[PDB]
Symmetry: C3
């Protein structure tokens, strides 16, 4: 029993990993308002389901996602978490984008806020909003400034042109570029590594990484993580299992998080 998503597939590479496959490549994997809402409900489930540790989003064919359904938008409030629940997500658990092709407009605004990004060599990225008389207002602009630097975010967003996977790796957004055949396996390998770690440790690490984008100073972010999360982490059954496993020189057996 899992939520379903119209025009998409929901599957489980392992019992601890959720995969969303965007499955309307015939429409360049553009996302309707109804699909967007159903994807937001899947992430609500994911975040709340204690046994799920990591999620992946990917596309099909030559498209990752070309953004919102423009036929529908032509016939529209901009809020958090935004299109498919990603551009302005503040996640409790990490989501990996596996970008297999065109990643344009709202689709690129989705990826700019994913936790880890891997891309096939054929993937391309762009914000063509400026060419059509609108703008990328889903939340990517300040995020791209902080990942790519101002001048690279400016070249992408002001020009509206398409840029390669290799360019977005040199510029800081894409963690790894791999051959298309290896894309999903690479995302699953990274997800599997994360899924083997303590679920409490992964929750607290996500909080610490978020504070880096939320607070004016690195010291306020440092104090906040200790003050809000350190006692709770050390109180958990998982931390005590970690210490029993060290002292006993054996592998730790983790339980799902309540944090």
């Amino acid at each position: 029993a899992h939520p379903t998503v119209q025009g998409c597939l929901v599957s489980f590479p392992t019992p601890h990993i959720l995969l969303l496959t965007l499955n309307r490549p015939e429409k360049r994997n553009c996302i309707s308002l109804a699909t967007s809402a159903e994807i937001q409900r899947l992430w609500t489930w994911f975040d709340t389901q204690p046994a799920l540790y990591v999620a992946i989003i990917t596309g099909t064919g030559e498209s990752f996602c070309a953004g919102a359904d423009l036929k529908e938008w032509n016939d529209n409030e901009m809020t958090a978490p935004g299109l498919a629940g990603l551009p302005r997500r503040r996640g409790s658990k990490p989501i990996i984008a596996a970008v297999n092709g065109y990643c344009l407009g709202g689709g690129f605004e989705m990826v700019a806020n994913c936790d880890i990004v891997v891309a096939s060599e054929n993937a391309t990225f762009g914000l063509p909003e400026v060419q059509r008389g609108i703008a990328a207002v889903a939340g990517s602009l300040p995020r791209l400034v902080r990942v790519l630097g101002k001048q690279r975010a400016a070249e992408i967003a002001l020009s509206g042109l398409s840029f390669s996977a290799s360019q977005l790796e040199r510029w800081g957004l894409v963690n790894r570029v791999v051959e298309h055949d290896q894309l999903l396996a690479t995302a699953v390998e990274i997800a599997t590594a994360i899924s083997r770690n303590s679920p409490d440790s992964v929750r607290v690490t996500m909080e610490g990484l978020h504070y880096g984008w939320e607070m004016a100073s690195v010291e306020e972010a440092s104090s906040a993580l200790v003050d809000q999360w350190y006692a709770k982490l050390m109180a958990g059954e998982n931390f005590h299992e970690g210490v029993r496993a060290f002292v006993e020189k054996r592998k730790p057996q983790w339980r799902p998080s309540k944090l």
Copy 2:
């Protein structure tokens, strides 16, 4: 009818693009207080002139700009927007630096806050202030921390040594390195791409990119762009021309912005 700049040339690669050429290479394109003020007035004109969409700054000979005239400084308040109106500029429209040679001291502080940076292979960058008993206080230090990262900004600013175009591209400031023959054409190509987009879209994108450097959190920056600019963008004649062009499957005909 355009403003003039002593020791510089003002020209128009297209009717929508302004080029400033620093034209005192015999003095390493150092900028006097009077020249600095005249360049600030040219950018005031540029920002206010609705038909101008993008600007470029470049030098001549083997110098882009070696900073302030040191003979004059030896015989001096530090404020926004600073030397030649660039180090602490908060621009409505983008300025591209085309760095053709020595980019030192105040000249590097200018470039650190330009929107896009392209450089010839022979260009070099440095902040020699620390070698002379002063410091780079025109506004580059926090900006370089945010583009290069702390440790690379530290190596440049603490050492006062010169670094290559190729180094400043690997480190994030320079968008592209090209052969000297191709430098101006490359800047003009990028400017032309931006100049073809909706002038309203480019204004709103500039605002969104700025908020990335102005607000503590990416969410405050995301909310601010929607709250301040989204209604105004969708009210504009340009947005309606964008939608008529989509529905009619033809090229949009843009008008200058009032935003």
Copy 3:
């Protein structure tokens, strides 16, 4: 007469440069609570000693530092400046890390906040905390987000795996990768370049670089540096020696800073 550090060596490559050598490679250069406190007192001395301009930290054997002594931690408040006084240091004078091998857990949290980082080709970096049921809470997470970008900080911190020197150079933390034979000489060369500059200029530059990590906006950081430090820098005997040396066309003779 200098402070001593148990399990470490304190030496002076030049009269203006302090070197700390972590000297317990037999325990992977893990740092006990008592050693951590003694290193904090050495940096207090360093910061206060007017004749010392730059410091270096390095390890021995195949280890830079594998973090806290885990035998001792198993038998623990997290505050600034943290392990060996580095993860949450706000330094008056720069510290260079020369990473010669394993740089793990607290050892990586140390390096993430050093001013300049050089590494040998064999060096490796990781935060294995998540694999043991704890988390990297010494202050590195928000700092790594700001140096590497969110998605690269996420891959390192969420996975807990080891990453090469070459990877951490491509990603922005490591200034230079060199052969192991050349590591200390490379750190000393950079320190020597900084040590030749005005000690007042280096103090003010450090402040300006810090404000980049401390204030919400680049303009607040720009104003703060001018308002707090510009008058003091121009009042100093070193600034006047800089101007006498320019006018007289000779080399400046610097004095230690009181700033």
